[PDB]
Amino acid sequence: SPIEEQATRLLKEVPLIDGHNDFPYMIRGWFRNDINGQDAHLYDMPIGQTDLQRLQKGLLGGQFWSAFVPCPKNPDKEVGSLEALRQTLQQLDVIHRLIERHPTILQFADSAASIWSSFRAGRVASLIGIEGLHQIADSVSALRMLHRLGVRYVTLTHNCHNAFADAATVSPELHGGLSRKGERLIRELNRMGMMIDLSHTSHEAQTQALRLSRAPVIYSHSSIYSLRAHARNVTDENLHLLHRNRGVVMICFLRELLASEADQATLAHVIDHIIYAGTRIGYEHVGIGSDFDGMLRGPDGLHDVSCYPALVAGLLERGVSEEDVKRVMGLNVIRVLEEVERVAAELQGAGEECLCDELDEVWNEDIKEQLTRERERVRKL
Amino acid sequence: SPIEEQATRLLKEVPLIDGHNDFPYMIRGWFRNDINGQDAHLYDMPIGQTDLQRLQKGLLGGQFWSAFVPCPKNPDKEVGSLEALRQTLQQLDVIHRLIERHPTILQFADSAASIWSSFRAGRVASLIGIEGLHQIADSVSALRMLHRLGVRYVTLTHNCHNAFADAATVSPELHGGLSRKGERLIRELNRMGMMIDLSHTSHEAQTQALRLSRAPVIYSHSSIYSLRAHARNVTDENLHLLHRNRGVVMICFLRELLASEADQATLAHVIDHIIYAGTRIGYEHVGIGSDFDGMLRGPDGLHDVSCYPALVAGLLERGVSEEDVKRVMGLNVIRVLEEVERVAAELQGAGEECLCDELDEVWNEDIKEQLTRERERVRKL
Ligand SMILES: [Cl-]
Ligand SMILES: [Cl-]
Ligand SMILES: [Cl-]
Ligand SMILES: [Cl-]
Ligand SMILES: [Cl-]
Ligand SMILES: [Cl-]
Ligand SMILES: [Mn+2]
Ligand SMILES: [Mn+2]
Ligand SMILES: [Mn+2]
Ligand SMILES: [Mn+2]
Numbered sequence: 145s146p147i148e149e150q151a152t153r154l155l156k157e158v159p160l161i162d163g164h165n166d167f168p169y170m171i172r173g174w175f176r177n178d179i180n181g182q183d184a185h186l187y188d189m190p191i192g193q194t195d196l197q198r199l200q201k202g203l204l205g206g207q208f209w210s211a212f213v214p215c216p217k218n219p220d221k222e223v224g225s226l227e228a229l230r231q232t233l234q235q236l237d238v239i240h241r242l243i244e245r246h247p248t249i250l251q252f253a254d255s256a257a258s259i260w261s262s263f264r265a266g267r268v269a270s271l272i273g274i275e276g277l278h279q280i281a282d283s284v285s286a287l288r289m290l291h292r293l294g295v296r297y298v299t300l301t302h303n304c305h306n307a308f309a310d311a312a313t314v315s316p317e318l319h320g321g322l323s324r325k326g327e328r329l330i331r332e333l334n335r336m337g338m339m340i341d342l343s344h345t346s347h348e349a350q351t352q353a354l355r356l357s358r359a360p361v362i363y364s365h366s367s368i369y370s371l372r373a374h375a376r377n378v379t380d381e382n383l384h385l386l387h388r389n390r391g392v393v394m395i396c397f398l399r400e401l402l403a404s405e406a407d408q409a410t411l412a413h414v415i416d417h418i419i420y421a422g423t424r425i426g427y428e429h430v431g432i433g434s435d436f437d438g439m440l441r442g443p444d445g446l447h448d449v450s451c452y453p454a455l456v457a458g459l460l461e462r463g464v465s466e467e468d469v470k471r472v473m474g475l476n477v478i479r480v481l482e483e484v485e486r487v488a489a490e491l492q493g494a495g496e497e498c499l500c501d502e503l504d505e506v507w508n509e510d511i512k513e514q515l516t517r518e519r520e521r522v523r524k525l
Numbered sequence: 526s527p528i529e530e531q532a533t534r535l536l537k538e539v540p541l542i543d544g545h546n547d548f549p550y551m552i553r554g555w556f557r558n559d560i561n562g563q564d565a566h567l568y569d570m571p572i573g574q575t576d577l578q579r580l581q582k583g584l585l586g587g588q589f590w591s592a593f594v595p596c597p598k599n600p601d602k603e604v605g606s607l608e609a610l611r612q613t614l615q616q617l618d619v620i621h622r623l624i625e626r627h628p629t630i631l632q633f634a635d636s637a638a639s640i641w642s643s644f645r646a647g648r649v650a651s652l653i654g655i656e657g658l659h660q661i662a663d664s665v666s667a668l669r670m671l672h673r674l675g676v677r678y679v680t681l682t683h684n685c686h687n688a689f690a691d692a693a694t695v696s697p698e699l700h701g702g703l704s705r706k707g708e709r710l711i712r713e714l715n716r717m718g719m720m721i722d723l724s725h726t727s728h729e730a731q732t733q734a735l736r737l738s739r740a741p742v743i744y745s746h747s748s749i750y751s752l753r754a755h756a757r758n759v760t761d762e763n764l765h766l767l768h769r770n771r772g773v774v775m776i777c778f779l780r781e782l783l784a785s786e787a788d789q790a791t792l793a794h795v796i797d798h799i800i801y802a803g804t805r806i807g808y809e810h811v812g813i814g815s816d817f818d819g820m821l822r823g824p825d826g827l828h829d830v831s832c833y834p835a836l837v838a839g840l841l842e843r844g845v846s847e848e849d850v851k852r853v854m855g856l857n858v859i860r861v862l863e864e865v866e867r868v869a870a871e872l873q874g875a876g877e878e879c880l881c882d883e884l885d886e887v888w889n890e891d892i893k894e895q896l897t898r899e900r901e902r903v904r905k906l
Contacts, residue, residue, distance in 0.1 A: 172884065172887060173887050173888045173892075174888075174893075176881075176884040176886070177666070177881060177882070177884060178881040180878040180879070180881070181878075189900070190896075190897055190900055191893070191896035191897055191899070191900050192896060192900065193903075220604075222604060223601075223603060223604055223607070226604070226607035226608065226610070226611060227607065229607070229610065229611060230607060230610060230662055230664055230667060233664065233666050233667045233670045234664065234666040234667075234882060234884070236666075236670060237666035237667075237669050237670055238666070240669075240673070241879065281611055283611055283614065283615065285558070285614050285615040285617075285618035285619070286611060286614045286615075286618075288618050288621075289614045289617060289618055289674055292621070292673075292674055293670055293673055293674065440895060440896070440899055441899060447903050447906060448903060497561040497562075498561070498622065500557075500558060500559040500561070501558070501615060503553065503557040503558060503615070505557070506553060506554050507554045507555075511554075512555075512572070514821060515571075515572035515573060515821070516571055516572055518572070518821055518822060519570070519571055519572050519573065522574075522828050522829060525828060
């Protein structure tokens with residue numbers, strides 16, 4: 145078919161970069177992060193919507209792999225919060241090991257340049273995002289270390305309120321958008337060069353974040369509220385504020401977010417959502433954010449990671465231009481990452497102060513006096 | 526003076542690389558890791574044996590900065606262990622910020638090549654080590670992420686027994702050397718390319734580690750048992766096993782480890798310890814491991830980081846050759862790091878299996894059956 149031949153050409157010319165895939169959590173569920181001698185299964189998985197053979201088959205150019213861990217359920221909130229931090233390091237560890245053990249397929253990327261170099265070499269650009277600020281255990285120091293471990297976006301919440309922002313699905317509201325700590329964290333996220341992800345956050349938290357952020361943000365996996373009213377989808381108000389922000393809405397394949405009856409959801413519905421956003425806020429502010437492996441079953445025609453060529457072909461069939469399809473595929477999210485890094489370099493170049501954690505005093509006045517007395521003795525020498 | 530002129534030449538030709546300095550913990554004590562607008566104090570500190578002016582003055586070529594946090598004291602052992610992990614990320618964070626905010630003085634290094642490039646550029650090669658396996662919260666995943674954050678040695682214990690090994694200063698013995706987990710961790714440390722540090726560990730733990738390790742190890746800050754009997758010093762038995770291991774003993778300036786009466790300890794005593802080791806196991810297996818800022822007061826003549834030229838001059842005065850002084854200064858620890866990286870590349874190249882954490886099951890049989898049923902449905906399409 146001419147249209148399928150065109151879709152294949154686009155997928156080789158420009159990387160399709162998906163905003164969110166939970167394959168690392170499936171590895172934790174199935175293998176418990178022990179992938180030694182499991183290549184036969186990693187290439188052909190007995191569960192889930194992602195494996196390394198189907199990943200090649202769908203011609204995906206890049207992927208933000210999710211380092212998600214669940215919201216803490218422990219009655220002791222200090223334990224649960226700290227447990228989430230350790231689990232985050234476990235998920236970052238298995239992602240890095242997955243990439244390093246399969247270097248012909250996957251190549252780690254943390255920038256626009258590293259995405260392109262991976263794509264030129266014929267590998268899936270493998271980026272990392274965490275899904276919720278519960279994962280950092282109220283530590284901005286930990287967050288900067290997660291950035292150093294390769295995390296390039298942070299979803300502000302998952303399905304739980306945290307100290308920084310409100311989640312969409314939980315009620316009643318705690319902060320009513322962002323907290324004062326949340327507002328201050330937006331500045332730090334912009335300064336360090338971390339992409340803000342507004343998926344899973346409340347409508348009011350999106351509005352506040354979209355006005356406050358000095359860099360473009362993303363929705364890593366959210367769809368359109370006007371087509372399907374859901375707390376997880378993006379309102380027309382926030383779509384416009386995303387345009388002013390210069391951000392990108394990466395459209396989700398979650399059936400609940402595409403149709404009132406989940407079993408009615410299709411590839412056509414995903415294309416409707418992409419075209420709605422592209423028509424109203426321009427095709428330079430729309431992306432693809434599957435949420436593959438964050439669901440049991442996908443829409444008809446988008447059952448797994450092998451189905452991306454049907455999405456590219458489907459967009460071309462509806463009359464979206466090649467250049468606009470290339471934008472939706474990956475150029476837009478590359479631009480956002482590039483601009484986030486530019487803003488960070490600008491703010492770091494200007495010598496902006498970093499956000500520090502509130503630490504306990506480890507020395508009393510007796511120890512501090514001993515140290516100052518000792519220093520003075522050394523000055524006498 | 527001719528000898529001081531010779532010492533200055535050696536310090537410009539070859540980097541003096543110190544094995545252990547706790548300046549990052551002094552920053553946590555004094556500033557609580559908030560160094561914004563504190564450059565005047567960071568260059569001229571009101572406390573401690575390290576600041577950026579005195580660091581330049583002593584002509585130090587490189588430094589393993591300690592990311593130490595105390596042994597957990599919480600009655601709830603799960604909380605205390607997880608707290609230590611978060612505190613470790615705080616200390617790694619402040620070390621990276623200290624380096625990044627002072628790029629004319631400090632440059633991050635994690636390899637032999639990066640040490641030399643830093644030294645050619647006229648900067649202190651800034652490496653990182655953690656002091657105790659209590660810092661990883663029983664997580665090998667976390668340990669691999671610490672390696673990715675720039676940690677290049679791990680002291681197996683501090684002043685507390687952990688799940689892997691026995692500390693020197695604590696009695697009674699728990700494991701009687703290394704545990705079974707400890708033995709297995711030695712293989713993983715060798716595989717990932719992490720230097721094993723045997724300072725603070727028991728004599729029996731040293732003996733077992735020195736026989737088991739496939740890469741050379743270090744003592745980041747330990748002195749000689751035969752000259753001064755202390756649990757923290759290295760016995761003649763372990764000195765010989767260090768020779769077979771190809772490791773390096775980096776001699777400590779702790780007054781308690783140099784003399785029976787601490788107030789009698791001197792620069793001359795440090796030189797006696799270096800010459801003892803150099804005479805008996807060769808000058809290619811001896812280094813300098815101050816432990817500056819791990820003590821209130823240092824020996825007479827080694828009061829702070831500005832005093833390294835007196836140590837180099839003192840060694841030359843005693844009849845140690847230029848080439849052997851250059852070895853003790855830094856070439857030896859560079860060799861150990863280089864060999865640790867070579868062994869890791871060899872084992873990783875051969876496809877050796879990594880040590881994985883014991884994780885809980887997150888899915889029950891009902892969820893796993895749903896996933897396999899779903900996968901089969903996709904295979905039918
Ligand atoms: Cl290009
Ligand atoms: Cl699921
Ligand atoms: Cl704290
Ligand atoms: Cl060289
Ligand atoms: Cl102290
Ligand atoms: Cl666990
Ligand atoms: Mn997810
Ligand atoms: Mn999600
Ligand atoms: Mn120390
Ligand atoms: Mn110590």
